Each structure stands twice: as C-alpha cells, then as structure tokens.
Design a protein around this ligand. Structure first.
Ligand SMILES: CNC(=O)[C@@H](NC(=O)[C@H](CC(C)C)[C@H](O)C(=O)NO)C(C)(C)C
Ligand SMILES: [Mg+2]
Ligand SMILES: [Mg+2]
Ligand code: NA
Ligand code: NA
Ligand code: NA
Ligand code: NI
Ligand code: NI
Ligand code: NI
Ligand code: NI
Ligand code: NI
Ligand code: NI
Ligand code: NI
Ligand SMILES: [Zn+2]
Length: 284
C-alpha cells in the first residue's frame, strides 16, 4: 500500500531574487532527488513524494518572517502555511506537508552551520507538518530528504533508541559519506514503519490529482559544474580544479563545502558523475 506525500514547496524573496526565472525548475530538481531517495528499497515502505503546490514569495509581506534563527523561521513558517491549505484532502491543492527554501543562512542555538530544521512525527498534522531548508546549492536535496525524515518520525541515527537496530545514512546528524547502496539505516526503516503501522500517516493514502511534473533527468543534466558552484558560493563563483568533491573559485583561490558533484554532471566527453565517480554514460 502506497503513501503519497502531497507537498507544497515554498521559496522566499531571497530565493526569487537569486534564482530569477529558473527558481521553479530548481525547486523541482531538488525535490526530484529527494523523491528518488524515498523510493530506495532500504526505507522498507512505498513512499511517493509529489508536488501539488508551489508558492514563490516575490513580496516579503505575503510570506512568513524569515530570519537567521532556524526554529523561529520554522515556527513563523509553520503558522503562515496553515492559511494556504484547504481543509479537506479532497481538494487537489491540499498538502500533507510544506517545505520552505531560503538562501538565508540558518542558525541553531550554537552555530550557523545548520542546514535545515523540522519537527518530529508531524506528517499528517496540518499545523505542524513543516520543515525549512537552507539553499546551499544542490545539497539542499539531501537536507530536504533528511528533514522529511523527522517529519516521518525518524530520529538521528546516533540516538539511544537506534543502537540495537544500527555515519553513512540519511539521518546522520552530520554529513559524512552516504552509503549509496543503503541510504536509510535500520533505525530509520523501523521508525517510519512503526509510525505508519500505528496509523499516523492516514492522510498519505490518497492519490494526488494533477501533481506537478518532476524532472526525470539527473540534476547534473540541468546544472553543470559552474552552475553548482554558483548555487553554493554565489554567482561569481565557477568551477575550479573529480565527481567526489566540488571545488569552486573565490590569486587563484578555490574553496569547497566538501560536497560531491551532482549525479549527471559532465566530467569529460561521454562521461559524467554518479555516486562521486566519473563513469561512462553508456554502461557495459
Ligand atoms: C556540514 N554541516 C552539518 O552536517 C550540520 N548538520 C545539520 O545541519 C543537520 C542537517 C543535515 C542535513 C544532517 C541539522 O542540524 C539537522 O539535524 N536538521 O534536522 C552540522 C552538524 C554542522 C550542524
Ligand atoms: Mg493560497
Ligand atoms: Mg592563479
Ligand atoms: Na546555516
Ligand atoms: Na553557515
Ligand atoms: Na534514524
Ligand atoms: Ni523582516
Ligand atoms: Ni549502517
Ligand atoms: Ni546577478
Ligand atoms: Ni557578477
Ligand atoms: Ni569544469
Ligand atoms: Ni572545509
Ligand atoms: Ni558518496
Ligand atoms: Zn536532523
């Protein structure tokens, strides 16, 4: 039995200004990647992330107050989105979850290293099914997937409860090398399973009506190395030096956040990046 996560994607003025006309494709590209992660067999469930609504905030007053404070930005957001949801799931534009993208550097109660935030186990509560995501380039697709984990009640993989069952998975509290063959830990698989078995995802049973089409291409087909560097380091950045770490310009100064090149990214004629390796596009 199939879960469809009817989603609204929302992007603030910083996003509108940075991305201009390409913003909606960018959001859908981010979400296509997350949607793929949620189809991986390791999650032990059938889960379909679909978009039913996008809102861009060209006008700051028509959005929530976005600030550097992650949990307030999230509280501002989760309240504001309520007004934008029809009350029956019968309405084609009714969403089970809302996600805010900002270029604003989000900060926790210690550092601004924070890349996103969500509340835990909220997926079918319209007043709390929310997450906020820092757009630091195409890595935001993983941030999205991670925060939607929490919304599905998965805790961090280093939490006491995950000891029996289990930093190489989606719900690692810090980024490391993701185990591309099994992105979801045994703890994540069990915790989302329990949540749904306990009947907490009843709003995820109904199919989307006229959902917004997700890009079927890999993200590096849309966005070359220079473009990815621009997403992370601003429009004046471009690619420096392959596939494992993207270095970007900033004398020749280059810099990195230690992220991989997006899957699909060209690394020479007839080759492109997959799981941080430059492989042939035609597979033998
Ligand atoms: C390179 N930086 C990181 O890994 C940061 N981690 C995060 O930002 C987490 C999200 C990642 C997508 C794992 C976030 O704190 C979270 O748990 N959201 O629910 C650090 C640990 C430096 C704060
Ligand atoms: Mg509305
Ligand atoms: Mg030089
Ligand atoms: Na941040
Ligand atoms: Na930061
Ligand atoms: Na987990
Ligand atoms: Ni303000
Ligand atoms: Ni493991
Ligand atoms: Ni410009
Ligand atoms: Ni310029
Ligand atoms: Ni290059
Ligand atoms: Ni560094
Ligand atoms: Ni990797
Ligand atoms: Zn987390």
């Amino acid at each position: 039995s199939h879960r469809y996560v009817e989603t609204m994607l929302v992007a603030d003025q910083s996003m509108a200004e940075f991305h201009g006309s390409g913003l909606k494709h960018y959001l859908l590209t981010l979400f296509s990647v997350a949607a793929r992660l949620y189809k991986h067999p390791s999650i032990r469930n059938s889960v379909s992330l679909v978009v039913v609504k996008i809102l861009v905030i060209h006008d700051e007053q028509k959005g929530p107050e976005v600030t550097s404070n992650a949990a307030l930005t999230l509280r501002n957001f989760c309240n504001w989105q309520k007004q934008h949801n029809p009350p029956s799931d019968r309405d084609a534009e009714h969403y089970d979850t809302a996600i805010l993208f900002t270029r604003q550097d989000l900060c926790g109660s210690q550092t601004c290293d924070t890349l996103g935030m969500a509340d835990v186990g909220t997926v079918c509560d319209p007043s709390r099914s929310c997450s906020v995501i820092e757009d630091d380039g195409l890595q935001a697709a993983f941030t999205t997937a991670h925060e939607l984990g929490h919304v599905f009640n998965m805790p961090h993989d280093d939490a006491k409860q995950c000891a029996s069952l289990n930093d190489s998975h989606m719900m690692a509290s810090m980024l490391s090398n993701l185990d591309h063959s099994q992105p979801w830990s045994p703890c994540s698989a069990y915790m989302i399973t329990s949540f749904l078995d306990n009947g907490h995802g009843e709003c995820l049973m109904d199919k989307p009506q006229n959902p917004i089409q997700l890009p079927g291409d890999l993200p590096g087909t849309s966005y070359d190395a220079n473009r990815q560097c621009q997403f992370t380091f601003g429009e004046d950045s471009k690619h420096c030096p392959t596939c494992s770490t993207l270095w970007c310009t900033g004398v020749l100064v280059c810099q990195t956040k230690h992220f991989p090149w997006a899957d699909g990214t060209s690394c020479g004629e007839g080759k492109w990046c997959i799981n941080g390796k430059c492989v042939n596009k035609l597979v033998p």
